[PDB]
């Protein structure tokens, strides 16, 4: 079917008005598109790519940290295994650290090599490749002209944002509401995945190499875990590279596209994808949540599956909601009531769990807690755990305050008496946020 193959959602923008210009972010954030190429985009805004380029990083900060994928050197769309006998979804990824002076050095002789064997004239075995990725960029004193650049962006599009729900969460999420960057040597893959708590992303290529993008709608992604799943993988952990032939048998619709330099790409709300450099480039990406009953769906969704899974969420979306119904009026019918639906569940809940505590003779402690203090992780499992926290006896005591989530407590003192309960919020306070969370008009 030519609808297995779709035409790419794309922008081109001339100047500052298109990227400012309104429809252009409704155009992204519309559930019907699973990608937005905005084509142009550092040209129309007059953005320095040169900020990122890689002779400008190793000058910044030249001993940085930078996670190296190993990885081979695959033919166009394909995964082979190693001997070359047949295309398989998994991939070879291994992973080490570098600097991003060490890697630079790699990335330039890679290309003066490459411009040699050209220069020699005339399935696999296939060669090796490193992949620098995931390179940090939150801190603003090491990345200031860098950070400051991309604040020149449409407001929608930012890492920091009024509209932005990673900005509503209060403290920062690694990678998410900071910016992350890839050096890259052709051949080096971002392997199929969804982004976390399926919150939208945002990459832009530096260049001056061209990526290619594989992008497939949200509502298949359950076709892409079975594939994962029959194949002995895990797709929320392992690496893997869709067999399209597969995919296209499965009757599942594929988005591919070529991001060149200056072009973002913008994956909306929980958009599977892969990606692999064509030439020589750097990214940088982000993740950004709008507004929209689509996206608090969707990363509530995930955070839901995380929990079957085993696999934390880097989104606390419980912790995330309160601050929602603290802090921003919501005059989005479907989105309001989705929010007050969570919070009603959670407060039952809490209420419910409050109460067998105090009902078997648990002393609940008043603990309280600091402004812009991030949400709390079971040490144990890792889920959220949010307002009743479960400490040891010793760690209480310490002050050192490790917290464990009431089944993980349970599991290993029976009747909690290695532990005490510790209560950051009056449940009065909690109500209070609740009733006041009302729908607001807006005529939009
Ligand atoms: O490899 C990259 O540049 C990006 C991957 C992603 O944004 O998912
Ligand atoms: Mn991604
Ligand atoms: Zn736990």
Known sequence: KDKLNPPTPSIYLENKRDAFFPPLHQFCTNPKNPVTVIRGLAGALKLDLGLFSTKTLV????????????????????????????????????????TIAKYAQYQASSFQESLREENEKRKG????????????????????????????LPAFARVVSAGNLLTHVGHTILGMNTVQL?????????PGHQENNNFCSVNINIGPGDCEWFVVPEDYWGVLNDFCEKNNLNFLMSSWWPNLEDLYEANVPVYRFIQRPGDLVWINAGTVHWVQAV????????????????????????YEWNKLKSVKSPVPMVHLSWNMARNIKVSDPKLFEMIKYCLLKILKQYQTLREALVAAGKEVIWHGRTNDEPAHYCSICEVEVFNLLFVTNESNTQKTYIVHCHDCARKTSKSLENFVVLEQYKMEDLIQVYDQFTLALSLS
């Open 125 to 152: 075995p296939f060669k090796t490749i490193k992949f620098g990725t995931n390179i940090d960029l939150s801190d603003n004193k090491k990345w200031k002209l860098q950070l400051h650049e991309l604040t020149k």
């Open 59 to 98: 000058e910044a900060n030249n001993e940085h940290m930078v996670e190296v994928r190993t990885q081979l050197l695959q033919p166009a769309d394909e995964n082979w295994d190693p001997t070359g006998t047949k295309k398989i979804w998994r991939c070879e990824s291994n992973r080490s650290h570098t």
């Open 182 to 190: 890839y050096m890259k040597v052709p051949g080096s893959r971002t």
């Open 279 to 302: 030439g020589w480039c750097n990214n940088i990406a982000w993740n950004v949540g709008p507004l929209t009953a689509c996206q608090y769906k969707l990363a509530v969704e995930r």
